[PDB]
Amino acid sequence: ITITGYSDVLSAGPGETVEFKVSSKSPHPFTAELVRVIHADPNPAGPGMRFEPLGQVFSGTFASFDKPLLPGSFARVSGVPAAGSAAGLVAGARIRPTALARGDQCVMSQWNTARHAGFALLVSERGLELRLGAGTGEPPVCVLCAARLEVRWYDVWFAIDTASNRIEVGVTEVDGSVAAPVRHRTLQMLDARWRAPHSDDAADLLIGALEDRRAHFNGQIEAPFVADALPSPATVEYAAPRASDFSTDALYAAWDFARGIDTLKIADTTPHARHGTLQNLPTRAVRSSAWNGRERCWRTAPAHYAAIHFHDDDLHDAGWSTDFAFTVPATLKSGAYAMRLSVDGATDYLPFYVRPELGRPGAPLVFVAATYTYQAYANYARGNFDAALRDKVGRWGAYPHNPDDHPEVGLATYNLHSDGSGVMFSSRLRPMLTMRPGFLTFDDSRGSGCRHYIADSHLLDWLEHEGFSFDVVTDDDLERFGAALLEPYAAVLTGTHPEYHTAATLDALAGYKRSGGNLAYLGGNGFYWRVGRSERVPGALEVRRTEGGVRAWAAEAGEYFHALDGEYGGLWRSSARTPQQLVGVGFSSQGPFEGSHYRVLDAARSQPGGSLLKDIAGPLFGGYGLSGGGAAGFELDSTEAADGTPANVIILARSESHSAAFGPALDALLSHTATRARKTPDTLIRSEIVYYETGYGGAVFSVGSITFCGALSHNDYRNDVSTLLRNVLIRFSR
Template identity: 45%
Template structure:
């Protein structure tokens, strides 16, 4: 989990360097590589009203995922698009991800970023066979970063690492904290920080799907090392065996946060309900309450996001919905919804009872949906949640002139106040 390569150079971050995502490009003998790094403001010295939370834990957990559907035909698309040329499926000796298995068939439960991570490179295609961009994680989150620059919205970034280490202090004072497309993996410390921020009057903008889903822990002596136990159920790449449900690093019970008494609905009002291939659908506006007109200011369409670079639609791949049994009883408004009308999605295992019944008690088609929601907390905080992994992929469409871009602009303006 640590290649222990020698350091060839160091780069000292200037005090006045703006917070953001940067790329270090290195060249040697006709070859080059490009490695991202994240510049955060000094603790307690924010430089903007908006904070982007970068999902570095999720990036690491997925690091070097050798996908089971990888095919040589992907290489043709990669070459034609001049995308990042290397794939973990071709170079397994660099270490695989927690979505892969050891040679004895057991699941890989530890991950670290102290190695080459192919899928953390600019231009990496997660889905080489998709008819759309095929971008996920770091690359998909660049849609949001590009949108912020296009809209001239100032922002700082904070990564999961700072949030885990510094707690709510890392994001205190920001008027809004916005996530990327897939903030799936969290420690108890990061969830505590986000809930503390929200409950102290902060604004949380969740722009993904399948977020806040799995519990992970950090090694107490090496914070770069993460552990995941895929206990009980959930949509998972492998299943922990009996006796392996507890994390070795701290003895805590692993698995879904839902099974640990902290479902995503308690934080953002919605939680993971369905998954499909890398395809997307539009949302349909369902809220016409005049108190919520600010969300749709300048938008005359009922269909939202029937376009996009990720799955061709703003609601896709992994979807979240509201479940009143799991939230904290907040007055949650469903703004828009997207239903799986073509039966291209499956219900997640924790929602299924039999092949005919599910926990909702209603038709399966009714719960395979994305809910876009807004609510205020009892303590003055507010939350907007998109409920879809492909939402951010619609932001740059038509050079950012589209209804998803307008909607998010309205949300940011409401939360930040300008």
């Protein structure tokens, strides 16, 4: 990829600054030009790509530096001497390797690359291997403990005993009750192939990787330790040495991963206090060896959560230097923007949002950009970027690079890691190819195949063409400012897929409802998953797919609480907040990216809010759209009084004729033949458009379909779907 980058924040109000971090692998400088994004879908059959150039607001030419992406998580203990004494060196850990077929993976290492001095303890399908530096003029010593290690808890160690003139490398299975527990060891004579380190031999101590930066560990490490003497003799042929076996003197370090589970620090419990720092956001708050099932929450039982899960594809915070900054002038109207980057014919877009001042709005409407959901889907490598799609990207002039070809940009929370575990973290401090104008997600046979940021621009482009002024706020803005940020507006509008939320963003929308506002839920499958977040780890979102529902992977028992903020993760249902309580409808069906039509329930025209159907002939409508060819499609929401729909809900229309591939949302089911309402599951395959009054003075309008806004621009913005939204926004504006 020639040029790409990211910003430290995704939204800034008047007087706030966005720092942009660009990586350019050209030898010539690049250009940055501010644009306002109007339509980001490059499908020729629709409005096409549309920007408003604002180079006169911000323009610049800047020097190109090529900055790298290094996936793989690990911990660095810095500013420590080389380990060892004249008596020797001992190091070890409790480990659970989750992908040994991937090669040499380092448990712990300390290596001065220049002086060829240090140690490294590694595992692979060959067993447990010790590498010792031998100086500038000898190849390294290697001692191998051949064992067939599986995905279980093992104790691994090496010991250099000068007095006995022996090296030992061993591995013992922690659970001795299994039928054939592994216990192997290798004994070599030392023969002055090792001598106590010297002051200049110093280097950082790493856990999970090796620096001469490679051999990233996949799986769990628990309680690593280093000692520079042999264990105090106490009274099974051999056992693994652990930190408890050493005098406090002899301990060089002993890390307890149970301390600080919601932080990036690994704590050393010896008086040396040789702490370390985790890099690339490994997964904490996972079961360790003492976990037995009686404890399920790391906040009250940290000794059962005394391990950290490392993955060789973890990616958080690229650490790129800031190429330029932009401070929002008090005259730039709130909207959706980007920095068009350009060099050698290659272009990127760095999207960001200009947020209104709290309490003084610039329009009657505000749109909520679903940045938590964008970030959770960020860089989803869907394995679908085949020749036919790659061809369409060219023909249409769409954003040229896809996560399937670019694993250097890391994964989404819809992916699995290399060892097969679910990706629980997603960073926004990296290039997010899936949030670029022009990016296509699906080879859509009946439309563009655009999602999230790009598909949300259908609505922003429609809002503009119909003369509706709007301000834009993000999920982070709601997290920061609360309902008070929304209160000034006559209606709040969602995107096409507001799926991921915190208690703060849900509370912002409910408080806005309670203040008397109007809510336009213009998507499907909203308010379904919880995200975790921390002030202590900015730029990361956490997702733990607990219990059930439609999920790309399943969290393990006991690991349901977030590490970032300690909250119970998973379905919002699972924390007593169903979508129906916010917007009257809830996720009920999911199928492929294909849409269908609505049918008017004409009984509605006479009820409160049935005038919203005026100028829609019917009885069908909406059988068109840039998102899968229909206004009701992909993921659908319907009414459930039991799941919280208000008794005054007015169903205006109800979809039909979805393909046989549409099935029921699992979390709505007690069995494969009965819903939670004890109806049959086929009653779930439908999208329902509803209207109701909140009882606080405002109303709610819900479409329950991700593809709904994809139909707005059909027939040059003149169609039934366009007419319906116009009726809503006119009504919501008195």
